[PDB]
Amino acid sequence: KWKIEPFLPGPFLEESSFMTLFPKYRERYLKDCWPLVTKALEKHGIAATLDIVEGSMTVKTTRKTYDPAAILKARDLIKLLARSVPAPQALKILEDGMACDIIKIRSMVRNKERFVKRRQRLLGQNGTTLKALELLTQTYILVHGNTVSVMGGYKGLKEVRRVVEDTMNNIHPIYLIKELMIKRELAKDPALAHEDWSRYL
Amino acid sequence: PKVVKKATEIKREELAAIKRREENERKHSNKKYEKRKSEREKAVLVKQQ
Amino acid sequence: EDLYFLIKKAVAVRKHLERNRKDKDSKFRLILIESRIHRLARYYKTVGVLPPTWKYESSTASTLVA
Amino acid sequence: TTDHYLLRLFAIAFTKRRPNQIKKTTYAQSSQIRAIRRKMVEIIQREAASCTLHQLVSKLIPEVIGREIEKATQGIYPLQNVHIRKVKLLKQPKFDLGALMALH
Amino acid sequence: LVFGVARIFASFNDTFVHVTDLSGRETICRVTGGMKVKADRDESSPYAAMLAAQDVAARCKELGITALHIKIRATGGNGTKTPGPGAQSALRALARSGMKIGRIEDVTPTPSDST
Amino acid sequence: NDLALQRLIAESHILSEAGANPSHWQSSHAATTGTNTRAFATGRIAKKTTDMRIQALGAKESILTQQKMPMNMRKGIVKHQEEKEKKRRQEARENGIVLEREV
Amino acid sequence: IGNLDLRSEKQRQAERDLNTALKKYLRKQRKKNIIDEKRLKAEELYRQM
RNA sequence: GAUUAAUAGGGACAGUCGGGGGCGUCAGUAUUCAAUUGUCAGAGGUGAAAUUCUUGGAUUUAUUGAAGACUAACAACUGCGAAAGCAUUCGCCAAGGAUGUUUUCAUUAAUCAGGAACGUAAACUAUUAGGGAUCGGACGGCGUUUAUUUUUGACCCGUUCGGCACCUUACGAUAGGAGUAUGGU
Structure with a gap:
């Protein structure tokens, strides 16, 4: 009911193409880590070029593409690659059941020092709270200045969005991870299938 | 000893910095059409009798 | 005089503050x-360059501008 | 324009990164930014209040306006690219089927 | 060939395959995922969008337009601004069961400053 | 007050570095690295986690770490680890990613 | 033991002192597919020929 | 009759600079509400549900109008203000900082009793002696680009003030708890 089958086999009249721009340090990393991305995108059937003059990634559908979702996967892939995620993580968003999201978190806090405190609180001591959030939601979270990048499945995306909202609204991430652990236990045992779970939080 | 090694690393950093300053001044100034004065020449400011 | 420029500046900021x-x-x-x-x-009172009874709160301002 | 069409033009311009530079940030001071926007408003108004709507869109297709903006603003600060990102016709006051079939 | 434009409104909760003419006003056919799957939990499934796209493509080829411009969107006001598994699997099922695809555009409403 | 939460927070590093996060690239590459698809991966992870719990309970030294090295291997290991952590902090400062504060 | 490390010596001296092949070069660089301003100049030269 | 003119002060002028403030004005979307049209069975949540809205047509699609809010991306190991705080365009109003001067008065200074103006939270924590960045002036000048050629601005680099921060150096410094018993209440 939830499983996505791999596309087995010209579905594009107008040769579609997407573009994104990036700065110079990203140009250095993208140039010495590009051939992985272009091998995987050629396997899916999408021609991808990088321009170190202008600083622009371009993806475009070739003649031999058949998977039509591949161009949108390519668009989100190159958006994240400009947004400085690691390249193996980008090739993992090239999977079928994967999806990204960005959370703008600068608007939700007014005071500068309070926002810095809450962002470091979301990241946690030694990265422990972050990696434990990644564990309990099966996602990958990257606190990126004013925005928070996240990749994973859709249920986990909703959970991570909720947790980021509550941590910015000053509900502590330790409280949130305790909530998530208890919810995980109630997901394990099946005799508690459909009741109001609020009696345990 | 530690003080001498520390201060000589700082001395190398300062001398390399001054050399890069003089190098950029040569490359971007009108002094480009001259020969680099040797340092054994640069040691004596003036001689008089 | 320094005091003249300063009281002129005070007059200016007071007029703007009264308008806003x-x-x-x-x-x-x-x-x-x-x-x-x-x-x-x-x-300047101590050095004696002006009368010791010279005062400014707002009427000196209004008189010096009028 | 000449045909009593009131319209709004929203133009967007990105700052040029000059070749042979080492400084990573190509920031312009706020005085330069206001002067560049003033020149942009001047150029757009001067090349949009002289012509008709058909001439305006015959200008909009090959992007002459961004080219002239770049050509006239590169002296105050070079611009990487100048596009006209929105063109909204607000009010049309006439129904001239003569001019309409003249287009068609 | 006649291009019809399909709005795929793919939330996290439900999926909307919507087919209109180039105006966007004249609705040809729409099929959601909730009207094809019984479970509200499974309402947003790639299976739901697969069945929805099969129904929609069957309808629009029985009309005979066989070519679609695709506009995908998501909940954009205070939501996530990213489409759904409905969107991906629906596009896949569509161009598998026919439907020469023209221009793809991800037209989501992005607020300048919301709240 | 809670304990199992403290265990999860502490041992997340080992668990996610071993095998349990199929969306993180390190965790998937380590789910097929060879030393976690070997025969007793969960047992070796159990050994590491039991040492971590005793270290939280109050032991000052470890059981997994080695003690005697010929100073060249140890200086090489320590220099490489410090260079890698500094390189990650620098490649975070560039691109603006924030990491955890630690002296 | 004692001969010149020729590559090291040429690099040291560099540090002190400071129409058939371009076709296969462009073929090699068209599989990257980095735009590469040197490849740009080379493509302009190949346009000129 | 009246000193140096201070590497302590204030003032003037000029070119500037700023997401400093106040007033009006201009837009941008989005949200909500409403209208019109195409609609045709769910839409909406949630881990799962439900409440609710739904043939008088919800959600959706397209076009408008009104209201109220905020100003995404740009957005920084930046900028501004005394703090709190300050990011749409433009106009006005005053103020303010830095720099330069072939500009003045010459202790006017520093500090704070008293006093006066501004106003849901927390939750891992005389130099250092240089260097590389950075922004604001100012001076310079091998050259690219505006430049149809002088302006002028952009890029490079050098000199000199000033300041927000980095690292290195210190020049130094200094500031009962848990178990286990016994007997009472």
């Missing part, structure tokens, strides 16, 4: 200018 009446940074700067004016005027 909402900001507070203008009030803070007017306070600082009034303090500087009072210290300098005190020094």
Whole structure:
């Protein structure tokens, strides 16, 4: 009911193409880590070029593409690659059941020092709270200045969005991870299938 | 000893910095059409009798 | 004179503050200018260059502009 | 324009990164930014209040306006690219089927 | 060939395959995922969008337009601004069961400053 | 007050570095690295986690770490680890990613 | 033991002192597919020929 | 009759600079509400549900109008203000900082009793002696680009003030708890 089958086999009249721009340090990393991305995108059937003059990634559908979702996967892939995620993580968003999201978190806090405190609180001591959030939601979270990048499945995306909202609204991430652990236990045992779970939080 | 090694690393950093300053001044100034004065020449400011 | 330029500046910021009446940074700067004016005027009273009864709160301002 | 069409033009311009530079940030001071926007408003108004709507869109297709903006603003600060990102016709006051079939 | 434009409104909760003419006003056919799957939990499934796209493509080829411009969107006001598994699997099922695809555009409403 | 939460927070590093996060690239590459698809991966992870719990309970030294090295291997290991952590902090400062504060 | 490390010596001296092949070069660089301003100049030269 | 003119002060002028403030004005979307049209069975949540809205047509699609809010991306190991705080365009109003001067008065200074103006939270924590960045002036000048050629601005680099921060150096410094018993209450 939830499983996505791999596309087995010209579905594009107008040769579609997407573009994104990036700065110079990203140009250095993208140039010495590009051939992985272009091998995987050629396997899916999408021609991808990088321009170190202008600083622009371009993806475009070739003649031999058949998977039509591949161009949108390519668009989100190159958006994240400009947004400085690691390249193996980008090739993992090239999977079928994967999806990204960005959370703008600068608007939700007014005071500068309070926002810095809450962002470091979301990241946690030694990265422990972050990696434990990644564990309990099966996602990958990257606190990126004013925005928070996240990749994973859709249920986990909703959970991570909720947790980021509550941590910015000053509900502590330790409280949130305790909530998530208890919810995980109630997901394990099946005799508690459909009741109001609020009696345990 | 530690003080001498520390201060000589700082001395190398300062001398390399001054050399890069003089190098950029040569490359971007009108002094480009001259020969680099040797340092054994640069040691004596003036001689008089 | 230094005191003349300072009281002219105080007159200017006071006229603007009377027209607007909402900001507070203008009030803070007017306070600082009034303090500087009072210290300098005190020094000038001590050196004796002006009459010791010369005072400015607002009527000296209105008379010097009128 | 000449045909009593009131319209709004929203133009967007990105700052040029000059070749042979080492400084990573190509920031312009706020005085330069306001002067560049003033020149942009001047150029757009001067090349949009002289012509008709058909001439305006015959200008909009090959992007002459961004080219002239770049050509006239590169002296105050070079611009990487100048596009006209929106063109909204607000009010049309006439129904001239003569001019309409003249287009068609 | 006649291009019809399909709005795929793919939330996290439900999926909307919507087919209109180039105006966007004249609705040809719409099929959601909730009207094809019984479970509200499974309402947003790639299976739901697969069945929805099969129904929609069957309808629009029985009309005979066989070519679609695709506009995908998501909940954009205070939501996530990213489409759904409905969107991906629906596009896949569509161009598998026919439907020469023209221009793809991800037209989501992005607020300048919301709250 | 809670304990199992403290265990999860502490041992997340080992668990996510071993095998349990199929969306993180390190965790998937380590789910097929060879030393976690070997025969007793969960047992070796159990050994590491039991040492971590005793270290939280109050032991000052470890059981997994080695003690005697010929100073060249140890200086090489320590220099490489410090260079890698500094390189990650620098490649975070560039691109603006924030990391955890630690002296 | 004692001969010149020729590559090291040429690099040291560099540090002190400071129409058939371009076709296969462009073929090699068209599989990257980095735009590469040197490849740009080379493509302009190949346009000129 | 009246000193140096201070590497302590204030003032003037000029070119500037700023997401400093106040007043009006201009837009941008989005949200909500409403209208019109195409609609045709769910839409909406949630881990799962439900409440609710739904043939008088919800959600959706397209076009408008009104209201109220905020100003995404740009957005920084930046900028501004005394703090709190400050990011749409433009106009006005005053103020303010830095720099330069072939500009003045010459202790006017520093500090704070008293006093005066501004106003749901927390939750892992006389130099250092240089260097590389950075922004604001100012001076310079091998050259690219505006430049149809002088302006002028952009890029490079050098000199000199000033300041927000980095690292290195210190020049130094200094500031009962848990178990286990016994007997009472």
